[PDB]
Amino acid sequence: HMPVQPIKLYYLPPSPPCRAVMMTARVLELDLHLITTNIMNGEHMTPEYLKMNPQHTIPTMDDNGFILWESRAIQTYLVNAYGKDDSLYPKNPRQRAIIDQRLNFDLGTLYLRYLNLYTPILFRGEAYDQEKADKFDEALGWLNTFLDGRPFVAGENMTVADITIVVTITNIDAFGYDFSSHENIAKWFERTKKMLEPYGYDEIDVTGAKMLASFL
């Protein structure tokens, strides 16, 4: 029901996928043994890291010999294995399917289009590309539609999909994106912040976003 030793997370504070894992673990009341892994120094490119994770990415979860990367795979695993209840990731096939769709939308659409826009600006010093911006804005339109009639992305209760998606929304809010016109997102964003507030939201998500904001 609980892990035998603190689960190690090879992370970096500003990293969005890392932030989603950290907040999820807080809701499940799991304490993570946080270990910093520098990208520029090539701490992920060591012979020890490559054997553990051949993709050399962050975050990398180490649950006592059980290695796992990809943030959304970690999020769901932690609920399935160490969740006291299934509220964040319900077993009901139809309810789980909607969450899985939102998790897939996040990785394959929303977060991808986030990286396509901001990564050249933050780390390469490139200009704000409007073609890439329109794609990301289209994704925000779709996310707004998913929240039509629902307090959360996958239904009535907060899920792991909410925790990962909100990281992107926290990032753009720190950059200077005014998404209040997307009224479903605006109300959801305030709702999900309140839900994650006693679970280290400022400590994890805001701090991480602010660190990325200093690159502008």
Add this chain to the structure above:
Amino acid sequence: HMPVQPIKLYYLPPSPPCRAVMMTARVLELDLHLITTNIMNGEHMTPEYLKMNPQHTIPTMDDNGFILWESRAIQTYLVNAYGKDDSLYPKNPRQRAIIDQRLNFDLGTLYLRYLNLYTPILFRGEAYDQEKADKFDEALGWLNTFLDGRPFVAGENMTVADITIVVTITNIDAFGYDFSSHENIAKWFERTKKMLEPYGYDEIDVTGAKMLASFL
């Protein structure tokens, strides 16, 4: 245990995510009411289709009112709801985690880098892009490493992760891509072909890939 009516799938034969769903349904012994939805004929842009799917993409799963897109979320739902056993997608938290990672790897890396490389060449009639080719070959490099000491990507048995990944491998092979240097993939492809052979591999995946291959 079984769906109340044949699960409708708004699909197109050559579409890679559609083919992954179709083969998954065949292994689970589920019949699908296949509805042809021609993309660039404006059939996905109709008011009825937008109400069902605002992202206007294929495939779209209709299981008795329950609407779902994102191929990998569909695959997992079919096993969770209508699987006679959980062999293709096991309940075990750690066993599921590896599959979920491979599903995330497929959506996030393998398939994305496939689309970036081949979409311009197939549809637009453009030349091969070098930077996109490096990324896709790197994605195959990682896939080869995942298959080290494993007959299948997620472990000992064929899973839904194999079914979705093999579609990309079937496609490139049809386009004349040599991946024999990746010994693990080369052995795994021949293995997975035969494993899916009694579950309509030729009629679904090969037929689909050949329809895309004609564009070259």
